[PDB]
Amino acid sequence: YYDIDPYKEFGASVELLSFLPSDFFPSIRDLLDTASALYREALESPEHCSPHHTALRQAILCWGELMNLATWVGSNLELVVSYVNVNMGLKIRQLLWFHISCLTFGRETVLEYLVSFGVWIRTPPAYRPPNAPILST
Amino acid sequence: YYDIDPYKEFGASVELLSFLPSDFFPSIRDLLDTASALYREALESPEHCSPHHTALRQAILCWGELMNLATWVGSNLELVVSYVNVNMGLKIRQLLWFHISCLTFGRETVLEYLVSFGVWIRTPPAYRPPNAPILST
Amino acid sequence: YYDIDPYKEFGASVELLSFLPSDFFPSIRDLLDTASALYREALESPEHCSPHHTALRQAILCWGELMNLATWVGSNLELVVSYVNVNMGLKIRQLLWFHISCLTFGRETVLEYLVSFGVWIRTPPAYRPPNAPILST
Amino acid sequence: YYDIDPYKEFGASVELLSFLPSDFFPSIRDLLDTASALYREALESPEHCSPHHTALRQAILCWGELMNLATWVGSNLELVVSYVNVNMGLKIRQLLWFHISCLTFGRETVLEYLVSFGVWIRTPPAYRPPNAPILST
Amino acid sequence: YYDIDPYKEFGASVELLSFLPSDFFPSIRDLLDTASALYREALESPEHCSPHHTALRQAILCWGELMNLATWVGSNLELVVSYVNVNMGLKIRQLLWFHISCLTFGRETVLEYLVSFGVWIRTPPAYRPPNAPILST
Amino acid sequence: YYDIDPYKEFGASVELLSFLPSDFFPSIRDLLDTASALYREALESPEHCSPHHTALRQAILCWGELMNLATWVGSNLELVVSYVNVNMGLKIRQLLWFHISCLTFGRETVLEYLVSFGVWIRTPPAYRPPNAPILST
């Protein structure tokens, strides 16, 4: 009945993030592995240091209950995974990637990185520099 | 693939929510209508006013995408809505009711209200003081 | 052999609590669940803190051993069990109720409440208030 | 229902029992008589002399309750009794022996005594000291 | 049994280094020869100096024992050996490479280099720079 | 390839092993259990408590790797296993026993203990003390 911006409170819009191509976002298993390996103690810490940690906490709990629902559906079925994994992935990948990426790098440098990426990709391939993607800080 | 507590802001004791019977909590429609009519303006272009606002907005968003999934399942069926809520509603109710209640009342009054109600229900039914509802302030 | 009063160091006597009728004390399951859900961290703390915290530990341990005894008796079997249960039911209810109640409220007000209850029950039923006094604060 | 460490404040009873063999502990009636011939009056004092004292008197009360149960079972029987005696014998003997031994000697010397005993028993019998008994002080 | 992360005290995790492909790490023979020819005096020094110096000693000792195991298996014989070699090849390569690299360069820059490599590899191959980032200074 | 002294910083393992007989060391699983029942949590701490601690945890990781190899060999075999168990048993038992024993007791008392044991064993059996075991402290 209602719709809200996941990203506005951080200063980003759905249009801005959706500007990036869908295929660029990597898989989910590796993303979860990275997040866990980096912040097993941080996400489970008693104190809520930053809003990003909290937000990704409810996000990962949502994915956990959702995959639990998927398993329950598979057990109670009477192709099913094919249509559903993509339609959640095209959101969860963005969500998890944004919080973990903005957790480092300051959370602002991500904005200039994405705007430069959009400028680069809006250009036709007739003339195009070969080194677009994110730097390392 | 991992087990993390949804609550850490002193609500990590899921057993506290488990003590209260499931039937006690209200239905989804009433809570949604109350939250909408009471914080439609609050949950629109906000700042990091309080982590509760965040947690509840991601909660309503994830519920919204569950409902989008359910509606698309109904549009692409070949009972379906009957069994899914049997779990999903129980999870979401204990998820969001705490946040919406503790948003007012200070966030601590809910704690002793909860423990007092647990004591009251633990008391024998034969000798029961007349009532012990929620007290606003 | 020779028996020793447990409550005498606290300041009460077994027969003092013996005045309370059996139905007054709630179910053992609810009492155990309440104590666990309220002070799991305190019981599992490496600090003894209050002596009542210590006493509850061995009380829970011996009752857990008693269920082991019941399980072993049942296993050997393939009435008596009910009588064994109701034997220690009153005693464990007295001990657990006293310790749980006195853990909060300061441990003094329990004494006045119980002595007032003794006054109430010693009075013949004809000349009694319609309701019995209940614990406050 | 739950597995609770007996004395995590006092070391950790599980592994410390694990080092010692079960048969090392003496007969239960010998332990009872030894404690009795020492401290009949000390326990019955109306003061919490030590949390350790409260724990041990609660333990002996539990022992008396268990003996009352055994007497009733024998009186109302209609081989198992021997396994009842040796079943809790490890647990109750551990608790009682620990309390009696650590009541004197400072309550810390038991730790190094038992670790030395573990070192001694772990040593193969090819070369082993003839005896590693308790040391008085 | 229960496993313990070796790098966790240093500040890294096993799965963090697990991102690196097998071909990235050089031959074990060259690594061993390099370490020996660079710090023979340090390894043979009677002073432990850095804890990494200690760790490398037992790593070399256990690998030397592993060649002894291979020699004994071959002697008993008169495929399997290749599989056994390639099993520990990745692990010893990770350990030796990490310790050797962190011995110089300060031990911090390795962390940024590896996290940047993880960022690089998580990116799909299409949107990558022509070359991978390389260690500097 | 090369012969490296295991612990030249810690005395010199070669001759100190040479004094002691091979069979003096206990069974490997007893040593593992003894270390485990003591210091499960201490090892997993994210801090280099002692270089000795790092060495012993690396050693136990090597032990786990060796056991994984043994399990794979048994699963993929197509008498030798016994000599595998007793072959490294001297070396691994030396390392583990040394680390466990010298972790406590100050880490220097082991030197005089072993030299006294060497004096005792060098004594002919015509006149020899009945026992020269470890001394607790």
Numbering used by the authors:
A (entry chain C), B (entry chain D), C (entry chain B), D (entry chain A), E (entry chain B), F (entry chain A): 49 to 126, 253 to 311
How is this structure described in the published paper?
The N-terminal domain of HBcAg (aa 1–149) can form a dimer and be assembled into a capsid with an icosahedral symmetry composed of 180 (T = 3 state) or 240 (T = 4 state) subunits. HAF is composed of HBcAg, along with histidine and tyrosine tags for binding to gold ions, as well as a tandem repeat of the affibody for binding to EGFR. In the HAF sequence, the affibody was inserted between α4 and α5 of the HBcAg, the spike tip of the HBcAg. The affibody used in this study specifically binds to the extracellular domain of EGFR with a dissociation constant (KD) of 5.4 nM.
In order to solve this problem, we designed new HAF constructs with short linkers. Even if each linker was composed of two residues, it was confirmed that the construct could assemble into capsids. HAFS was self-assembled into a spherical capsid form, and the assembled HAFS was collected using sucrose gradient centrifugation. The 3D reconstruction structure of HAFS was also obtained, and the final resolution of HAFS (T = 4 state) was 4.41 Å. In the cryo-EM structure of HAFS, the capsid part of HAFS had the same size and shape as that of HAF or HBcAg. When the threshold was lowered, the affibody density protruding on both sides of the HAFS spike was clearly visible. Each spike is composed of HAFS dimer, and the affibody density protruding from the HAFS monomer consists of a pair of affibodies coming out of and back into the spike. In addition, at this threshold, only the affibody of HAFS, which consists of three protrusions in the three-fold axis, was observed. The full affibody density perfectly surrounds the HAFS. As a result, the affibody density extending from one spike to the left and right is more clearly visible. From the above results, it was confirmed that HAFS formed a spherical capsid and the affibody density was much more clearly visible than in the case of HAF.
